[PDB]
């Protein structure tokens, strides 16, 4: 019954400070302005200790993980990082590192909505997401 609260398949509804989140992170012109275009769809789902969280849209990326566990991803903008997920108080904390930089998304209900901030240094960027 971990992470019960996020399983199901949520909708982008609101979006503040990407843009300049993306900048803090080193991604270019033209991949900000499509990504910034982008409605994503999030699904997630559990199945036994394994976490998957799927992002659809007009790129579709997926990880699989293991609380506490890293693993190696490739993220939207094509940057291959290590991560590592854990549940702090019912927020799911995302670490992503790579070329000795760090960047934060975490993930919490509120509501009935699934709100995504993520922060790169001084910049934070909140994703609001409803239920499809
Ligand atoms: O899941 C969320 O709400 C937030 C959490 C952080 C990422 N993120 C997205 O939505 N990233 C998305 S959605 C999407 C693109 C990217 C994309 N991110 C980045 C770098 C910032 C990572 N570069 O492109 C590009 C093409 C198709 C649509």
């Given at each position: ?16 400070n990407?843009?300049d989140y993306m900048k803090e992170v080193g ?73 000795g930089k760090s960047t934060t ?13 993520c922060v790169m240094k001084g910049v934070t960027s ?7």
């Open positions: 019954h971990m992470c019960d609260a996020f399983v199901g398949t949520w909708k982008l509804v609101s979006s503040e990407f843009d991604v270019g012109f033209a991949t900000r302005k499509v990504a910034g275009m982008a409605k994503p769809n999030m699904i997630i789902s559990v199945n036994g200790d394994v976490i998957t969280i799927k992002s659809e849209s007009t790129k579709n990326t997926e990880i699989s993980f293991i609380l506490g566990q890293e693993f190696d991803e490739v993220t939207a903008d094509d940057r291959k990082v290590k991560s590592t997920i854990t549940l702090d108080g019912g927020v799911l904390v995302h670490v992503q590192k790579w070329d998304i975490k993930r919490k209900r509120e509501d009935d909505k699934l709100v995504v901030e909140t994703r609001v997401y409803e239920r499809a």
